[PDB]
Amino acid sequence: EVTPIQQLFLIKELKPGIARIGVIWDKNAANRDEVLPQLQRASAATGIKVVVAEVASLQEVAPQFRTLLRDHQVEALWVLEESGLLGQAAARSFLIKNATQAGMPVFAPSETWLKEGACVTWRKDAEGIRLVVNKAVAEAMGITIPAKYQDRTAFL
Structure with missing residues (x-):
């Protein structure tokens, strides 16, 4: 319900x-033809370069993440959905741990990721976007809440 471009403007x-931001994308997720060109448009609109790494299986997650880190030097990890592989505990734990140990915040699609170490997720209410924030991690990672959302922010 929060669109990719709305998300990247929030991330900014x-x-x-x-x-520079890294996206890990499950090749088996729906809507690739919509989401992936929207990421490139979001990139041009926001001024943040978006690099996408696609993965189909757990063995692809680790090498693809290292490409994002060494080849592209991304500064955060962004996960847009968790219907399949990215909804598995093993992939979720791997990505959060290696992002954190690289100094990168994780912007995540659900509170399950926050319960495991991700920084921020979001929801759309009648009064607009609301942020859900892992207070412990977000404080350490230097996450800052835009002024409009100061009153629309819940801590896990």
């Missing part, structure tokens, strides 16, 4: 200064 204010 949550981690200000960010210039």
Whole structure:
């Protein structure tokens, strides 16, 4: 319900200064032809370069993540859905741990990721976007809440 471009504009204010972000995309997720060109348009609109790494199985997750880190030097990890592989505990734990140990916040699609170490997720209410924030991690990662959302932010 929060669109990819709305998400990337939020990310721009949550981690200000960010210039490169990494997306891990499940090749078996729905809507690739919609989401993936929207990411490139979001990139041009926001000024943040978006690099997408696609994965089909757990053995692809680790090498693809390292490509994002060494080849592209991304500054955050962004996961847009968790219907399949990214909804598995093994993939979720791997991505959060290796992102965190690289100094990268994780912007995640559900509170399950927050319960495991991700920084921020979001929801759309009648009064607009609301943020859900892992207070412990977000404080350590230097996440900043835009002024409009100060009153629309819940801690896990």
